Amino acid sequence: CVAEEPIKKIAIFGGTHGNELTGVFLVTHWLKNGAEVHRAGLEVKPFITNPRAVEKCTRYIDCDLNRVFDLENLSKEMSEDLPYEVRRAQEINHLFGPKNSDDAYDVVFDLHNTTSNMGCTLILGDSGNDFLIQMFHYIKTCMAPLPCSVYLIEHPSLKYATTRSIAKYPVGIEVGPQPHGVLRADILDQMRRMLKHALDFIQRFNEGKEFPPCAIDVYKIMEKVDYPRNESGDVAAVIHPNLQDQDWKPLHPGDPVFVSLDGKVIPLGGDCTVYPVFVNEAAYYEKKEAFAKTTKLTLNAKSIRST
């Protein structure tokens, strides 16, 4: 049985990538009128993390703002050649951190959007975080039967740099599919419902509605699969129709994954059935990720309550 102190400070970040509109829209709204994210006891703080990128409806200025929160860049000396995102990340790590410190904000919900058919999705940066497993189980249960998938991205060899990683309790709230630079009312309503059930969880966990022991089904990142590309640099094939929009559904070695304009079909291969996520995401053409391979498993969580 775990026992944690009451959560006090909550920051909801929108606009880390200025062209993923949903997060922008809500933070704009809430800042204006904060009744929707008001909860007694909490100091839920909505905040925009890239006005410049949002103001021009673009993803980033110099570099991805979600890749520079590694202490390495946070403790970098200030200059003029300094990337904008860095000049902004250092300010963020100062206002809502410092990263890994008793002063660090308690919870940061960083809102994102994807062009892939992923549906309601939650991101966990630690399979050993019982508080977050309980929050996620609570969200899935409350939103049922509307799915709210959990993407587990943990292995410390690739988990250590994000805007929300300064949070004593970080949470990624992905929401797609949605073309970047577009606002779909349906996606806005879903992102809001996810946040509605999460912020409620925090006030309840406080009120003493101690939670029973339980686990959740999650998708654990295995590895990213790039696009086969010509000796040149540009891709030489396109996501197979049968795979298109099929995030989360098991893939088998012989199932078609890519197809060239000539019509050749490239199957999955390998010897194991995997689950595809972030299939055909626009922002990832440059990161070299046609989709990410993950493994499906269970994560138990000890019963929890507030001190």
From Zn ion, its own copies, none, interface partner of 238 (C-beta below 5 to 8 A by class):
its own copies
**Which residue of 156, 234, 271, 298 would you call a contact of its own copies, by CB under 8 A?**
234
Residues 6+ positions from 205 with CB-CB distance below 8 Å: 4, 6, 7, 131, 134, 135, 211, 304, 305, 306
Choose the stretch contacting its own copies; rule: CB under 8 A; options: 24-32, 90-98, 158-166, 210-218: 24-32
Q: How far apart are CA 245 and CA 279, in angstroms?
A: 7
Interaction between residue 47 and its own copies (CB under 8 A): no
Catalytic residue among 4, 154, 174, 231: 174
**Stretch 100-119: interaction string toward its own copies, x if CB under 8 A:** ---------------x----
Strand 265-267 to strand 256-259: parallel, antiparallel, or no bridges (unpaired)?
antiparallel
Q: Which is nearer to Zn ion, 112 or 220 (CB)?
A: 112
Q: How far apart are CA 273 and CA 165, in angstroms?
A: 31
Q: How far apart are CA 51 and CA 172, in angstroms?
A: 20
Interaction between residue 17 and Zn ion (CB under 5 A): yes
**Which residue of 40, 78, 144, 185 would you call a contact of its own copies, by CB under 8 A?**
185
Element spanning 29, H or E: helix 21-32
Exposure pattern of 274-296 as b/e (b: 16+ CB <10 Å)?
bbbbbbbbebbeeeebbbbbbee
Residue length of the chain: 307
Nearest CA to 214 out of 155, 135, 111, 123 is that of 135
Active-site residue, 4 included: no
From Zn ion, its own copies, none, interface partner of 112 (C-beta below 5 to 8 A by class):
Zn ion
**Which residue of 4, 28, 143, 295 would you call a contact of its own copies, by CB under 8 A?**
28
Structure letter (DSSP) for residue 201: H
Q: What are phi and psi of 229, to 5 degrees?
A: -130, 150
Q: Which is nearer to its own copies, 16 or 115 (CB)?
A: 115
Whether the Cβ atoms of residue 36 and residue 192 lie closer than 8 Å to each other: yes
Annotated binding residues for N-acetyl-L-aspartate: 59, 66-67, 160, 164, 284
Q: How far apart are CA 180 and CA 280, in angstroms?
A: 13
Q: How far is the CB of 187 from its own copies (least distance, A)?
A: 9
Interaction between residue 164 and Zn ion (CB under 5 A): no
By CB under 5 A, what part of segment 104-143 binds Zn ion? Answer: 112
Annotated binding residues: 17, 20, 59, 66-67, 112, 160, 164, 284
- Residues annotated catalytic, as ranges: 174
Q: Which residues bind its own copies (CB under 8 A)?
A: 25-26, 28-29, 33, 57, 115, 177-186, 188, 234-235, 238-241, 244, 259, 261-262, 280-283, 285-286
